[PDB]
Design goal:
homodimer; Alpha/beta knot; five-stranded parallel sheet; two-stranded antiparallel sheet; 6 helices; binds the ligand CCN(Cc1ccc(CNC(=O)c2csc3nc[nH]c(=O)c23)cc1)C1CCCCC1; tRNA_m1G_MeTrfase_C_sf (chains A, B); cytoplasm (chains A, B)
Chain lengths: ~210, ~210
């Protein structure tokens, strides 16, 4: 897999060189290139943003700049990913489907986002996805791209979770549930399913 | 605000020194300390994990190690945050509520997670939250802690979003909607509300 991340904060993608994503890169399973968007600006101040049409707070990322960068990096085979709070929710099923892609391109936005026409134009020659990682506001798309890349890479390198325990058997007056010490696989699997189900009912009823 | 992050991958929290979170730290609004969990291990291999009780794939993070670190870092005023796929969903409302906290402690887990008793014990003297950032599997909690910290810090430093546009008026045969060039605030606000509503119905009907 080839991954290209376009941003004005290249340093923010450095966690990808570490741990599991770093091993996937080093071993040759993933080619990861991080690009500073300012390398496609032709002005003296290297401007990437400009004032919104119709007014409003904040700035908008210029389409010509984004368009130039995407022209050089993408192909018709590219899956262009635009992290945004306006997108569809990223899920494990999305991570799973993205492991079948040959070339992922993450267009990380800053300010109030990227000019909508960058996406309309890109969609003329490639598949484009506007994706959110969850119902919260981030200052930019880089940390969301780390999350999305890590989820994909962990699958490449290969109900709510119940409680887990390890040694000691007793710690600060807290005992590991006796069932885990029973030596009975079937009783353990049934107990793990029940506790996983109770946690799901309590914390995520939408998952049941 | 004081933020303490406990992890075996301290380098993975480096994006927090950059951009908006870095400015919140530098200006004195946030004290951020990142701690290597291995500094609380007393063995020759600096082990933090051990085999699960009742078997299963993967390893579990030792409670004594975690307990020692939390004993030194936390107080009764601490809000202890444990990032986990078994937790409640992190949302903007959660980010907003956390801006009222004096001391946040993020216990970042690796392997199959942290011994459940670390949380039961911590809850004897402090408020504890088990929090997930979304319905996907990450290799660890560090990238989720960056996401959660960035959301909180962006609020400290201070329906789905519709499309945004900037100069030029026409780009690659794509025109900025005429309404944005009308000079009529009320027509613009009504159009932005309608497009925001149509996007929400299409991409996130659960939000309506
Ligand atoms: C006026 C539109 N918004 C601007 C905005 C656009 C883009 C961002 C940057 N976010 C991401 O790039 C992002 C990328 S993926 C993602 N997932 C969840 N949440 C996210 O914010 C993101 C931040 C603020 C507002 C900012 C907060 C107040 C109301 C919404
Ligand atoms: C056997 C239990 N799971 C183990 C697991 C526990 C903890 C993690 C690490 N994740 C986080 O620390 C985490 C912290 S916050 C968060 N939010 C969304 N998703 C996340 O994974 C996380 C990864 C795998 C399985 C691993 C994938 C196959 C089924 C579930």
């Amino acid at each position: 897999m080839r991954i290209d991340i376009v941003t004005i904060f290249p340093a923010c993608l450095d966690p990808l060189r570490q741990s599991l994503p770093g091993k996937a890169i080093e071993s040759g399973l993933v080619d990861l290139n991080v690009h500073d968007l300012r390398r496609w600006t032709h002005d003296v101040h290297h401007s990437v943003d400009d004032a919104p049409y119709g007014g409003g707070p904040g700035m908008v990322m210029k389409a010509p700049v984004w368009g130039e960068a995407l022209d050089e990096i993408c192909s018709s085979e590219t899956l262009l990913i635009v992290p945004t709070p306006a997108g569809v929710l990223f899920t494990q099923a999305t991570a799973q489907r993205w492991t079948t892609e040959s070339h992922l391109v993450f267009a990380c936005g800053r300010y109030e986002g990227i000019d909508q026409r960058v996406v309309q134009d890109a969609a003329r020659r490639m598949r484009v996805e506007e994706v959110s990682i969850g119902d919260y506001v981030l200052p930019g798309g880089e940390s969301a791209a780390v999350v999305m890349v890590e989820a994909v890479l962990r699958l490449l390198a290969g109900l709510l979770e119940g409680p887990s325990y390890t040694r000691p058997a007793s710690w600060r007056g807290l005992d590991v549930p006796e069932v885990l010490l029973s030596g009975d696989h079937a009783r353990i699997a049934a107990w793990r399913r029940e506790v996983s189900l109770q946690r799901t009912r309590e914390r995520r009823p939408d998952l049941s």
